[PDB]
Curated annotation (Swiss-Prot), chain D:
Paired cysteines (S-S): none
Oligomer status and interactors: Component of the large ribosomal subunit.
Function: Component of the large ribosomal subunit. The ribosome is a large ribonucleoprotein complex responsible for the synthesis of proteins in the cell.
Compartment(s): Cytoplasm
Family, per entry: Belongs to the universal ribosomal protein uL4 family.
Superkingdom assignment: Eukaryota
Protein name, per record: Large ribosomal subunit protein uL4B
UniProtKB/Swiss-Prot annotation, chain F:
Family: Belongs to the DAP-DAPL1 family.
Name of the protein this chain belongs to: Death-associated protein-like 1.S
The protein's assembly and partners: Associates with ribosomes; preventing translation. Interacts with eiF5a (eif5a and eif5a2); preventing translation.
Part of the whole protein covered: 77 to 113 of 113
Job of this protein: Ribosome-binding protein that promotes ribosome hibernation, a process during which ribosomes are stabilized in an inactive state and preserved from proteasomal degradation. Acts via its association with eiF5a (eif5a and eif5a2) at the polypeptide exit tunnel of the ribosome, preventing mRNA translation. Plays a key role in ribosome hibernation in the mature egg by preventing mRNA translation, leading to ribosome inactivation. Ribosomes, which are produced in large quantities during oogenesis, are stored and translationally repressed in the egg and early embryo.
Amino acid sequence: SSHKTFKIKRFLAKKQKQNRPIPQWIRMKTGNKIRYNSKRRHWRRTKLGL
Amino acid sequence: IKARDLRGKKKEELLKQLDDLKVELSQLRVAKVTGGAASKLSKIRVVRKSIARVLTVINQTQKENLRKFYKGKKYKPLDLRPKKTRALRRRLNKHEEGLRTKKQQRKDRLYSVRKFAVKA
Amino acid sequence: TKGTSSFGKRRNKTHSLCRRCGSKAYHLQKSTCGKCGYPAKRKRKYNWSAKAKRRNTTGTGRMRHLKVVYRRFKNGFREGTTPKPK
Amino acid sequence: NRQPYAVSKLAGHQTSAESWGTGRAVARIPRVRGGGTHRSGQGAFGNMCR
Amino acid sequence: KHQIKQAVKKLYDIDVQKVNTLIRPDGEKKAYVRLAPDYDALDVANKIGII
Amino acid sequence: HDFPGEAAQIAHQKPRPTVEKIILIQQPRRC
Amino acid sequence: MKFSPFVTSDRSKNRKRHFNAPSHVRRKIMSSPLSKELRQKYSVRSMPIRKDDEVQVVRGHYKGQQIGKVVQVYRKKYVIYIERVQREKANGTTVHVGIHPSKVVITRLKLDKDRKKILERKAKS
Amino acid sequence: GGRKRPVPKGATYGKPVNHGINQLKFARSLQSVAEERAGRHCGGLRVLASYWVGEDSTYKFFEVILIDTFHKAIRRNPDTQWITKSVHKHREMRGLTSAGKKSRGLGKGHKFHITIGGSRRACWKRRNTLQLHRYR
RNA sequence: GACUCUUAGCGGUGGAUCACUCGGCUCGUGCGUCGAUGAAGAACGCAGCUAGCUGCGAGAAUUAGUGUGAAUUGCAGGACAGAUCAUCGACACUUCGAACGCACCUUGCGGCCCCGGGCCCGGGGCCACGCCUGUCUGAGGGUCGCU
RNA sequence: UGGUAGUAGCAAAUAUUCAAACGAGAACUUUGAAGGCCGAAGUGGAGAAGGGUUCCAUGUGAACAGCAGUUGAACAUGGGUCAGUCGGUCCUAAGAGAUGGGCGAGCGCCGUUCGGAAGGGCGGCCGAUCGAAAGGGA
RNA sequence: UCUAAGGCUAAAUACCGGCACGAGACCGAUAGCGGACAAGUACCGUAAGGGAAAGUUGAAAAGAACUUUGAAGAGAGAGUU
RNA sequence: UCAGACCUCAGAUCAGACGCGGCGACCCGCUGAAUUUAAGCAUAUUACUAAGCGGAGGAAAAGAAACUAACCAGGAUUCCCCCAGUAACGGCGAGUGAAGAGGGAAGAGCCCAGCGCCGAAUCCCCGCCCGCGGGCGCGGGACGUGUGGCGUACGGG
Ligand SMILES: [Mg+2]
Ligand SMILES: [Mg+2]
Ligand SMILES: [Mg+2]
Ligand SMILES: [Mg+2]
Ligand SMILES: [Mg+2]
Ligand SMILES: [Mg+2]
Ligand SMILES: [Mg+2]
Ligand SMILES: [Mg+2]
Ligand SMILES: [Mg+2]
Ligand SMILES: [Mg+2]
Ligand SMILES: [Mg+2]
Ligand SMILES: [Mg+2]
Ligand SMILES: [Mg+2]
Ligand SMILES: [Mg+2]
Ligand SMILES: [Mg+2]
Ligand SMILES: [Mg+2]
Ligand SMILES: [Mg+2]
Ligand SMILES: [Mg+2]
Ligand SMILES: [Mg+2]
Ligand SMILES: [Mg+2]
Ligand SMILES: [Zn+2]
């Protein structure tokens, strides 16, 4: 909704910044095992609820 | 920039060097969003830790003078009192735990365990 | 009906975020969190759920201060002194 | 001179799995409670169950 | 708004007519600081490295 | 970035349970 | 045998303490033997590897008598790089081949104020 | 008075053994309850003792003696430093006072075989522990 | 000979088997330490390039001190000549939370003191409840005295 | 992992066609033209609850969008929400809930006036506080 | 035979939590803790709660330059070992 | 009482302290079931268990006899072995069930009130002054509605 509280909007800010893909220079490190960001969330498939 | 070279500096000279590092870090933050160069992006972490060094010497100097001012006083600020453990701070003092009643002081003086040996 | 048509009439959040446990179990009308028992002075924990206890017990989080007491205990909680300088 | 070895007491029992009963075309084994997890609907207590 | 207005008057020694503040979706607060008509926003932008 | 397929669908895949839990009178006369 | 109850002989504990050793500990682990001329001069058998040290590969494919100076000490990979121990990639560019410090012998030591202090302590005992 | 069973509508769902609601007696005495309420309201004090001062048809009056274990008149007297210890925190909640200790069944002799080994639950746990030796 | 059947080679699907193990389990030993000096937990933020993990608190991927003595490393850089790491007695440690001015589905609403700037703005320190001792201000023919 | 099986199916709400453009590639995109539908209790234009970046620009055509796709609510990179006078904030509505008091083994519960309850300028109030983005409200 | 209705008091004892260690006729990735991995994570439910899957290139990335077909995936040579 | 004292009871963002929550394996005080067994089931059993609530500590608790015993006597508590699946309990059905003694681990014993002697001989607080303790106050209190010393059943003065 347009009528947001500060805590909810701040909560949506953190979840929006975490939705980035993994930078490709991480995959070139020594003991790298991460192929891709497995915690990606889509707005239509997984709802936050909070 | 070293903390050992800041110990002799006055508090006015430390504050003058503090704002010089703050105006430098702000210009590096401007260069970060305006493209800039990698030579200035690597300086961001350097100036950030230089501000931390100057502020640490300032905080450590005033905290030392506060402990020297409240040295040997009955009531000290809570940040100057020792923080060991909430349970430890509520124990009896070294003098209190060593206090014995006058009746026990006589039983310890007269009937203390002697040093002895038995032949067989 | 009781099924699909009834699920379309769900647009009123019952629970919200809690200020104590940060979970979404704070009942709005009851003003009471069903997870940590907020705003009761004591946290809601029960022995009939061992899995729920080990999800929010000491050690499951960050321990900003208990990890320091564990380090200070190995030295006897020494304060007011400094290492010998060079 | 040998040391005692034993399996943990909570092994295979730290789960709330209830049998679906009969009539579901299943094998009457205690299955994990439902959810959005691949664990949901799997045997959890018997020795034959993974 | 009073803190943002007083900050830019000390960091840049300019004058501010009004301050419009919004909080971006990413969690950062963006401040629209309009300068006095006697100051030039283009002159201050080039003095601090914006343009 | 040479893993485009799986990195794009990782946010769209949803786990599912192994087994999905779903929800005549027959009495003739002349006894 | 090992009689101290403070030291462990467990394979998992010794392997975990090796691959997760701090940088200042990996320095001690990444030691190399001194040459015959150096082992007799300083009376020290082995020293921790150093950047400007010259070494000779004694085992592997790049072993020989060519004295090469170390160019990089990669403690995170438990391997060092030598000035001539290298190979050419597919695109023609050369890349250094990692050699374990226990596979090279130190023929020349980068002697500074700290290097001579360690040679004096190791030879004193 | 006694202790009425706090169950809804007096319905204890179970066997007729536990169908009692009215004629039930609390395990501790009314004097022990007085110290528990006097010590709970004053968390900064430790209950020392208590005595009976009055009765009625519905009220029993007691006076509980509490101590401020952080007062210098208590911490400097070696005869009273024992109560300033942290092991005596809320003795009335653990039945360590004179009135709360009576309801535990402690004592020497054949009358108190049930509390041999400290408390009753300590005795029951030892009496029901299967000691399995190595070379049994 | 299409199809079909069997067998074998090879190639697919699939992942068994074997080998591997910085993990688990069990046993034993020594310690056995939280919090109003703000705990556990939670929130949010912090890296040149950084999502998660991890580590930190606006001094934010760490400061100082000490030990160690040339690295860190995915890449860039010169910050860097006491690098790095470990240790940790100094300092610092945002918001919520027993959470404490009143409230909180609100970054809402106040009060007091002090300071700076132009009643307004900013900063700093304070204002939960219960209770112990003492102090101060009181209350009632409750018991006396003096009027 | 099979037979089933390249099978069931891709059939509710009248309907598309022509030319051109971009492009390796067009029944599906875009522009133009024609023919139609919604027909103002709309298939129109704006909100509330809810969603939370789905909004916008550019780019990709790999997975997804059950045909395709040069397209997208997909993916990738940047950008975007500016208030004294719009709402919150303020008021109490049904309510909820502290204090005194009472109860209760106890966490606590009951209770909303009921106790020396006026912290103001001679004082009456009688009940702290919370509770409306559709009520009141410059 | 003891002297109730007042109090204090170490050791031998307990320890599935925590901290730090040593060990194993134990388990060896459908096993052993749910968790050898960004695991109480992803994900589900309004909530209380439920709760996974997932270890292995090589000794060393030396991870296949370059040529060529295709719009591209995807191939053919070449090359590393 | 130079007219106020005392008693009782209030207020404060008074001076200085304390309490709150977490953990809860072990430990202390309460509360409290039913599956189950009895081939049913009701007492019984499960069980003075789980769950529920309170309170701690590195241990806790207990602990120096209103004991055991009936002896030629033992001598605080806790734990181990044994007593013993025994005495006893129980629709005397199912089932339940200790202790004295004896052998070991460890061992440590003590303090009040009351009673009557001692000029309250006792204590806290503030300030000052010395090296968290000490003196000093012709400082403020507490206390005779009882502080301190002696003294506690083994007797004591
Ligand atoms: Mg949806
Ligand atoms: Mg005496
Ligand atoms: Mg279970
Ligand atoms: Mg005791
Ligand atoms: Mg095959
Ligand atoms: Mg769009
Ligand atoms: Mg677009
Ligand atoms: Mg398609
Ligand atoms: Mg997207
Ligand atoms: Mg309101
Ligand atoms: Mg309105
Ligand atoms: Mg343990
Ligand atoms: Mg497993
Ligand atoms: Mg507690
Ligand atoms: Mg039966
Ligand atoms: Mg039966
Ligand atoms: Mg229980
Ligand atoms: Mg012990
Ligand atoms: Mg004890
Ligand atoms: Mg029984
Ligand atoms: Zn909560």
